[PDB]
Write a protein that binds this ligand. Structure first.
Ligand SMILES: *Cc1cc2c(cc1C)nc1c(=O)[nH]c(=O)nc-1n2C[C@H](O)[C@H](O)[C@H](O)COP(=O)(O)OP(=O)(O)OC[C@H]1O[C@@H](n2cnc3c(N)ncnc32)[C@H](O)[C@@H]1O
Ligand SMILES: *Cc1cc2c(cc1C)nc1c(=O)[nH]c(=O)nc-1n2C[C@H](O)[C@H](O)[C@H](O)COP(=O)(O)OP(=O)(O)OC[C@H]1O[C@@H](n2cnc3c(N)ncnc32)[C@H](O)[C@@H]1O
Ligand SMILES: [Mg+2]
Ligand SMILES: [Mg+2]
Ligand SMILES: [Mg+2]
Lengths: 448, 450
């Protein structure tokens, strides 16, 4: 009987396991995949790292910053310089030193007042208990889209905001409760923290990619602690401990930490069954929809034309793009996303069809050289059986107030981690690390 | 390990309807059922010398499949009691008695209610029953909650309040949780707002003598010996070019095709190899089941009848929104049937049976009167706590789900086909729709074998 079994070797499960180990307790980590990292995933292509999952860290994300400094992983900055390209409907593409400058003064004022009003709501939502916001009932009964419509902003401001909503949540403003969106904004420290490159969540990348950071963290566990390719099928508990059922047999432990996405946590055969509020909470925490891609060129040819590699095209299937080129300055990479409904349409299509859509948008925005592609690499996170959607879960109207209170509460000897249980930077790597520290501290107090 | 033409997962009305159709067409069939019984979301226990329907209980006009099955298998109906005054208790003031609930409203309020139901029916008729995502305004209707749509109409507070009671009693969810497209499809599927909410002439018109689980048991008895396997949950469903391998705790069954006939949330928990396509997996994440605790309060006699009361109370501002006289034809024991719905169901499910009893008796004491404290017994079921349902009455879809994920609802995944009330075109969410879905999935499987 080990002291603690951890289900999942993402940043949450690995953080919890390392904290249990460092306190002197025995720990086993059971991971479904043949690798650690979960929603972070890095492959070597064209002599560099391709981050197919989470890739960016930014100011305010102190837990991931500290971990990367501890384990010796250096950062490099997201490129910021050169003209962004903005494309509206059937128009001609517009080059601007920033996205902002493609909108009128009145439009920019309406956008900043809309963001400001969402921040003023956010600041009233308690990070540990969104259901205890003074206006929780009203805010939980309203979609973000209904709230945006009630502000009277112009069409183009609503469309620009919607690009930002889809880029952050991997879901439309109609899918999200206003209470969910407000908690998320509060959790990150503001709308600028979510949407900015410099000063925001997209500021910095990790040299070598993110999955090798998770690997360095797993290398702090003793040999024998990690079991890969070992999906957890069942989790039983009684007065004396827990029993974990796998295809290849059973593990006995005193306590468990389940650190997987909510929809996957619900699919485990729990004995006794989870209490009904927690089962229905997981039914009400759907994962987002995102296809992430990297278009590979021999060189970042856009930079010589004075372009950043960032395109903003509210009427196209892809959202914002980014220059994904490593510090070596080759190969050239354009990074971007299909989000929400576009991700679901694109996921039903082949890699080749997705390639063709992306290359066509870039050809009409960055220029005709976009057609001279070396390679196109993508990942539909909704098709990953051990994730079933990126970036993370969202909550539709009525879920946070009625089912939300069951989010973190241990069920007997079973404790919960994962980015979706974080108070700060929920949905991000930094939040996953928070959640593992919290679950470890709970289990260590319970064993003692 | 055993080999058969068709394996059916689940012995609700959908799985049993399918299994019987496959059997009668001359194919070999196994039915694997997780529980030690058939019936699923229909469940009947014997208490106080009568039947207690803990699950589905009513059938009404326009439900032709369940009416035909009951007649075929010799199950008689009895009418839901209609007579006596209903009691309406609004957020303010004393309880009002009226020969019908509508008489509790002002003329302005009744007009507003009927115009709101009529405007919803007009939208509902434009929603194709086979493909709600092909409605001409699907994108707009799928982006709006039913609550937002109601707010836009400008009806008075008491009208929104009563409409909310009906919404929660029909969907086991609040108007905020539901897309307008979902609600509208459901209304079209039933044949209108009256069909959903009426007793006489609607879905609550009739009961089955003996209760509903005996009907499911008579349907299971139409299968050959050895076809039904109770207490056999399905854990895994592996498929290849030639068949499907069904994994249970103790073994495996090999079939040519499978019909999975379980609630959407439980279908998604089965270990599929290859994994389900992403649109389908994400649709199941967007099909949460409702939240209801159903109760029967037992009295020696239906005492409210001697006071000229129907035993129906309507309370927009109480944890119990609606009740019915549940008394069997013999006239004893007296029964008051009712529901905790939505947020009230989740709050009540966290408390004990005795605590839920004391909430119900408090509402009934203030509406039916003092004799409501003279309880012989109290029987209830939290359908959210049932591991093989995880919420009644059925799934609903939040905003954005029908147009983006919805097209994957019925489409087979190789040799795995889908049944259940949630896949029905007509009377979706009812026993009638469970039966439709079983006939459809059997016809599909029989056409694809040859
Ligand atoms: C997918 C993605 C995520 C992402 C993003 C872009 C995409 C396409 N961009 C990000 C970014 O640039 N910066 C950032 O900070 N975050 C970004 N995100 C989100 C981020 O990747 C996630 O928040 C974070 O990685 C989540 O970590 P957590 O540890 O909470 O969850 P996980 O990585 O999903 O790990 C769960 C592990 O459990 C395994 N699994 C699942 N089920 C089982 C069972 N039954 N048995 C055993 N193991 C199981 C998974 O395989 C996984 O390893
Ligand atoms: C619960 C409920 C339902 C209900 C209602 C009141 C309540 C509290 N009132 C209704 C009414 O008065 N009239 C009516 O027509 N319907 C009413 N409803 C809804 C109705 O009960 C359902 O629509 C209908 O019964 C649904 O039937 P279906 O056949 O589609 O589904 P099921 O009954 O849930 O059966 C599924 C079976 O599958 C088994 N199961 C689940 N998972 C597994 C696995 N993994 N392996 C094997 N078997 C599985 C279940 O145990 C169940 O038997
Ligand atoms: Mg810039
Ligand atoms: Mg009447
Ligand atoms: Mg019609």
């Amino acid at each position: 009987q080990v002291d603690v079994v951890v289900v999942g070797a993402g940043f949450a499960g690995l953080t919890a396991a390392r904290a249990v180990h460092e306190a002197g307790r025995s720990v086993l980590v059971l991971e479904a995949r043949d690798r650690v990292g979960g929603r972070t995933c890095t492959e070597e292509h064209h002599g560099t790292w391709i981050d197919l999952g989470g890739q960016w860290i930014g100011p305010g994300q102190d837990r991931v910053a500290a971990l990367a400094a501890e384990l010796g992983v250096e950062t490099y900055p997201q490129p910021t310089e050169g003209d962004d390209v903005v494309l509206f409907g059937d128009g001609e593409p517009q080059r601007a030193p920033d996205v902002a400058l493609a909108f009128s003064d009145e439009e920019l004022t309406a956008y900043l007042e809309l963001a400001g009003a969402l921040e003023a709501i956010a600041e009233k939502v308690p990070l540990d208990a969104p259901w205890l916001a003074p206006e929780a009932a009203a805010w939980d009964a309203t979609t973000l889209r209904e709230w945006v419509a009630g502000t009277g902003v112009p069409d183009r401001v609503a469309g620009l905001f919607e690009v930002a909503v889809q880029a952050v949540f991997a879901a439309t403003s109609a899918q999200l409760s206003l209470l969910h969106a407000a908690h998320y904004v509060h959790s990150a420290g503001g709308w600028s923290k979510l949407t900015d490159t410099e000063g925001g969540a997209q500021q910095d990348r990790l040299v070598g990619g993110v999955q090798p950071l998770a690997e360095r963290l797993a290398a702090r566990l003793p040999d024998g602690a990690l079991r890969l390719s070992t999906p957890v099928r069942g989790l039983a508990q009684d007065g004396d401990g827990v029993t974990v059922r796998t295809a290849g047999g059973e593990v006995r432990a005193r306590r468990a930490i389940v650190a997987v996405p909510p929809t996957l946590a619900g699919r485990i055969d729990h004995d006794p069954p989870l209490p009904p509020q927690r089962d229905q909470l997981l039914q009400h925490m759907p994962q987002g929809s995102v296809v992430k891609f990297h278009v590979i060129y021999d060189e970042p040819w856009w930079r010589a034309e004075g372009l950043s590699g960032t395109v903003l095209c509210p009427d196209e299937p892809i959202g914002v793009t980014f220059d994904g080129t490593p510090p070596a300055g080759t190969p050239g990479i354009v990074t971007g996303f299909f989000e929400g409904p576009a991700a679901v349409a694109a996921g039903a299509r082949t890699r080749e069809e997705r390639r063709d859509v992306v290359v066509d948008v870039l050809a009409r925005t960055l220029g005709e050289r976009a057609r001279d592609v070396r390679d196109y690499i993508d990942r539909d996170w909704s098709a990953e059986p051990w994730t079933r959607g990126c970036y993370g879960a969202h909550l539709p109207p009525g879920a946070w107030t009625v089912y939300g209170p069951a989010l973190r509460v241990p069920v007997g000897r079973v404790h919960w981690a994962g980015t979706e249980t974080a108070e700060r930077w929920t949905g991000y790597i930094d939040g996953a690390i928070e959640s593992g520290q919290r679950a470890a501290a709970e289990v260590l107090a319970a064993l003692g």
